[PDB]
Amino acid sequence: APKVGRLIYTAGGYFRQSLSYLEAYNPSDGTWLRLADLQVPRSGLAGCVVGGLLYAVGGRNNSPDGNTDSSALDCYNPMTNQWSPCAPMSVPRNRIGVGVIDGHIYAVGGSHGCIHHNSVERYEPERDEWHLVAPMLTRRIGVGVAVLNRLLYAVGGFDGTNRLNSAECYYPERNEWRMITAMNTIRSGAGVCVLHNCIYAAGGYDGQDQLNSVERYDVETETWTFVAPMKHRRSALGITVHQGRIYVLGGYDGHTFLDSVECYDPDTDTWSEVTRMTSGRSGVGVAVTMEPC
Numbered sequence: 065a066p067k068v069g070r071l072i073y074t075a076g077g078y079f080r081q082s083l084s085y086l087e088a089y090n091p092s093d094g095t096w097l098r099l100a101d102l103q104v105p106r107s108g109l110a111g112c113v114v115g116g117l118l119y120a121v122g123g124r125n126n127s128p129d130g131n132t133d134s135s136a137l138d139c140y141n142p143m144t145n146q147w148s149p150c151a152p153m154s155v156p157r158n159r160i161g162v163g164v165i166d167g168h169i170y171a172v173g174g175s176h177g178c179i180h181h182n183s184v185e186r187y188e189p190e191r192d193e194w195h196l197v198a199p200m201l202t203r204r205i206g207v208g209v210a211v212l213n214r215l216l217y218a219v220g221g222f223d224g225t226n227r228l229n230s231a232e233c234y235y236p237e238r239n240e241w242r243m244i245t246a247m248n249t250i251r252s253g254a255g256v257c258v259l260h261n262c263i264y265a266a267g268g269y270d271g272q273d274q275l276n277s278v279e280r281y282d283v284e285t286e287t288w289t290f291v292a293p294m295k296h297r298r299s300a301l302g303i304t305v306h307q308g309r310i311y312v313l314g315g316y317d318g319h320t321f322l323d324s325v326e327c328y329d330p331d332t333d334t335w336s337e338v339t340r341m342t343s344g345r346s347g348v349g350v351a352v353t354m355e356p357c
């Protein structure tokens with residue numbers, strides 16, 4: 065599964081306004097590469113990778129000239145350092161979560177103005193088409209999404225009235241969502257990823273405070289267990305997994321837009337500061353793929 069030359073890509077984000085940055089971190093030498101800007105600035109987007117291509121999904125352009133929720137899907141090819149537009153989603157989705165199953169991108173939840181989506185749709189890259197699938201049991205903006213064992217998990221978020229500790233799982237062969245065990249902590253805007261047999265939820269916002277706590281859901285035992293907390297509390301953070309470790313990037317803590325990047329080692333149950341982003345920002349999309357040419 066591991067291979068050389070993979071970078072952690074961070075796209076978009078927010079600081080004073082929505083951002084167009086695409087930057088890639090190399091854990092093997094600690095360097096950051098500045099790559100081609102997004103065609104449209106966006107925060108609250110999600111990033112994912114299919115077939116070596118990086119996709120930026122949804123979000124919102126918060127600019128001095130207005131606030132526009134995004135239905136856009138855009139594809140970055142590291143071999144060309146170019147972004148290419150794809151077919152748009154059926155609805156704008158800010159503060160979205162995405163997951164990849166069998167080469168298809170699932171776009172989950174998000175907001176459009178005051179509308180809080182429970183709807184979900186799936187993108188087929190070979191056909192460049194989106195199609196709706198079964199909606200979630202709960203409306204979720206700021207939802208964390210991860211895929212484990214070809215099952216799709218939607219974790220936490222905000223339904224428009226309450227931030228959520230609930231979570232649910234999508235079973236593709238049944239086109240059905242079912243609730244799973246609720247988290248120990250209410251979390252909107254948490255970083256959600258998969259490591260070994262567990263879904264991790266790191267940080268987020270409980271309606272009062274941004275969080276440094278981290279918990280993981282064992283899909284076998286169906287229990288949530290706290291692990292070591294991050295050094296810096298953060299919500300609306302970027303997250304990914306690389307070579308058996310969790311990386312959290314940026315976010316907002318109620319006082320600062322963080323540039324901090326922390327790395328979690330599950331064998332030692334410890335977080336370590338590895339690098340800083342070029343500037344502090346929240347609401348980024350993050351994914352791992354091969355380095356550009």
Ligand SMILES: Cc1ccc([C@@H](NC(=O)[C@@H](F)c2ccc3c(c2)CCCC3)[C@@H](C)C(=O)O)cc1
Nearest residue numbers: 108159205206222252253269299300316346347
């Ligand atoms: C991508 C994303 C996901 C979830 C959120 C949630 N909010 C936070 O997580 C909150 F902690 C926060 C975070 C960033 C910022 C602020 C406040 C205020 C200043 C601007 C940046 C939203 C749904 C909520 O629960 O209301 C926001 C954004």
